[PDB]
């Protein structure tokens, strides 16, 4: 209802989807995704349209819509 479904594209083009509220700070998504890869979150960078997602960003603040895509990149050196 205020939820939207997001596809998180990981580095192997595998996908995990999250249903989150438009107002949810996106840190939970990052922490859940990094936990499921068995990797440190700070080894990862979560991008929405190339732009880094902060712990306090929300889907609404970022302008996310239904089925929008987050890409998970390896963090840079």
């Amino acid at each position: 209802g205020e939820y939207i479904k997001l596809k998180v594209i990981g580095q192997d083009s595998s996908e995990i989807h999250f249903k989150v509220k438009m107002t949810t700070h996106l840190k939970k998504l990052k922490e859940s995704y990094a936990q499921r890869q068995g990797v440190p979150m700070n080894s990862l960078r979560f991008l929405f349209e190339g732009q880094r997602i902060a712990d306090n960003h929300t889907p609404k603040e970022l302008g996310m819509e239904e089925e929008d895509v987050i890409e998970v990149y390896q963090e840079q050196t």
């Binding site: 996908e15 999250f18 249903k19 989150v20 509220k21 107002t23 859940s32």
Partner: peptide, 10 residues
């Protein structure tokens, strides 16, 4: 390769 949906709590 199956679909994976996680529901997150606010």
């Amino acid at each position: 390769a199956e679909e994976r949906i996680i529901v997150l709590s606010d």
